[PDB]
Specification:
heterodimer, A: 197 residues, mainly beta, Immunoglobulin-like, 2 domains, five-stranded mixed β-sheet, four-stranded antiparallel β-sheet, 0% helix, flat, B: 266 residues, Carbonic Anhydrase II, twelve-stranded mixed β-sheet, two-stranded parallel sheet, 3 helices, globular, binds 2-acetamido-2-deoxy-beta-D-glucopyranose, Contactin-1 (chain A), Receptor-type tyrosine-protein phosphatase zeta (chain B)
Chain lengths: 197, 266
């Protein structure tokens, strides 16, 4: 197994007005296996970002999602990537982010930009699903199974964005739906979990 | 795709990745009637299938650059310079900030810009399997431009289109259109039109579009115009993606370079 280093070139500064949604791209280096843990640094190691319903880090693509930018977000951001199987971490050149203040931010409707795909699982496996929306105000994320009850042990984590189903049974397969919403509008996304037992 | 109107690789730079965008045959242009050549030998426009209702699998897709409708019916159109038959397959839209006084359109008439322009793109179904292939191969293309003015009452012939535009507000969203009659999206009279040789109005700016621009506008209401500015778009710059309302998604006007613009006679 392995994990190359991030490129040397600098990541150009970004100026974005408060209220807008943005995504900071991790752009992880070549690697194997693909069981990485993603984190983001603020300005320098080992100062890690605060995560909450407004700032989300995807464990599939490593991107940092910020529902709506706030002045307090000012800082430089680096993607910190760890491969547990080889006890190794590499992080990237920093994206300097410079919020542009606004006296009244523009409302944005919840828009889902992290969309889980169909998943196939063996009976017994754990399944994890991610959903997240840009939006101003910060959108609320809700989960449900389409026209069926959720598996009884399913857990919802990371400020609403992550649905985990444990020790998945055949009965758990079906179409799951993510709903995102703020007062300005809503969005939803659906896909299927298949269980092969 | 990988460009933008204003921003990274803005419309003035397109030529760097897409050379054809710099050719002397680019659209859009301004058209003044009295500078056109009245051509009474123009063949009358002929629309086949356009009065029939849309098929159920007709999707509208928010591409982040426009909202694009991929037609399914066997729509056909002939007329203008020749009676060559083309197949209509794609509709796109260009707008500004969605106000009556606003600009937004790409083409202009007598120097006037309109709040919204719809464009119907066509190809030769006999030389190509699709419009995309026709583009890739620099086949003869044909585009009809319909310009809009804000009226008072909602234009019901556009209800299905507008609801569609709403339903793909979110970036990348796709949705099936309710039934609509394509020919009813055109101006009440289509006899008066201009025709000139141009190009696609965004990369790769393919140089082979016969443009038909209609002289009579179509009317829609304010609330109708408004949904276009509720469309969201995500665009990459460097290592970041930025979300914005999609606005002013029109190309700046190009120079005619001695191209001739024909005008139909009525
Ligand atoms: C972020 O990076 C820039 C260099 O581009 C530096 O000038 C600035 O001080 C950094 N900010 C912090 C809080 O370290
Ligand atoms: C599923 O997740 C649980 C934690 O709740 C963990 O104990 C278990 O090892 C996981 N199942 C497998 C086979 O990894």
């Amino acid at each position: 197994g392995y994990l190359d280093p991030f490129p040397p070139e600098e990541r150009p500064e970004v100026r974005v007005k408060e209220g807008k949604g943005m995504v900071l791209l991790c752009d992880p280096p070549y690697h194997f296996p693909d069981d990485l843990s993603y984190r983001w640094l603020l300005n320098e190691f080992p100062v890690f970002i605060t995560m909450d319903k407004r700032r989300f880090v995807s464990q599939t693509n490593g991107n940092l999602y910020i529902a709506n930018v706030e002045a307090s977000d000012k800082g430089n951001y680096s993607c910190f990537v760890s491969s547990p199987s080889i006890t190794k971490s590499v992080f990237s050149k920093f994206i300097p982010l410079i919020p542009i203040p606004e006296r009244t931010t523009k409302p944005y409707p919840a828009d889902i930009v992290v969309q889980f795909k169909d998943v196939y699982a063996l009976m017994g496996q754990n399944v994890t699903l991610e959903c997240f929306a840009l939006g101003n105000p910060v959108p609320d994320i809700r989960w449900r199974k389409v026209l069926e009850p959720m598996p009884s042990t399913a857990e919802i984590s990371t400020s609403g964005a992550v649905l985990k189903i444990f020790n998945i049974q055949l009965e758990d397969e079906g179409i799951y739906e993510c709903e995102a919403e703020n007062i300005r509008g809503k969005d939803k996304h659906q896909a299927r979990i298949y269980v092969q037992a | 795709i990988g460009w933008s109107y204003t921003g990274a690789l803005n419309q003035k730079n397109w030529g760097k990745k897409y050379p054809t965008c710099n050719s002397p045959k680019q659209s859009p242009i301004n058209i003044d009637e009295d500078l056109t050549q009245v051509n009474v030998n123009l063949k009358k426009l002929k629309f086949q299938g356009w009065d029939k209702t849309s098929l159920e699998n007709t999707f509208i897709h928010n591409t982040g650059k426009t909202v694009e409708i991929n037609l399914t019916n066997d729509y056909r159109v002939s007329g203008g310079v020749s009676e060559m038959v083309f197949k209509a397959s794609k509709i796109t839209f260009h707008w500004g900030k969605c106000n009556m006084s606003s600009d937004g359109s790409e083409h202009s008439l007598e120097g006037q810009k309109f709040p919204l322009e719809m464009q119907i793109y066509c190809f030769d179904a006999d030389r190509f399997s699709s419009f995309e292939e026709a583009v890739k191969g620099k086949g003869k293309l044909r585009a009809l431009s319909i310009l809009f003015e804000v009226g008072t009452e909602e234009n019901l012939d556009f209800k299905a289109i507008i609801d569609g535009v709403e339903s793909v507000s979110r970036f990348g969203k796709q949705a099936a259109l309710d039934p609509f009659i394509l020919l009813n999206l055109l101006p009440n009279s289509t006899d008066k039109y201009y025709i000139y040789n141009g190009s696609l109005t965004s990369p790769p700016c393919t140089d082979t579009v016969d443009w038909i621009v209609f002289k009579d506008t179509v009317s829609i209401s304010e609330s109708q115009l408004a949904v276009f500015c509720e469309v969201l778009t995500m665009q990459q710059s460097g290592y970041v993606m930025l979300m914005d309302y999609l606005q002013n998604n029109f190309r700046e006007q190009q120079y005619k370079f001695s191209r001739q613009v024909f005008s139909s006679y009525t």
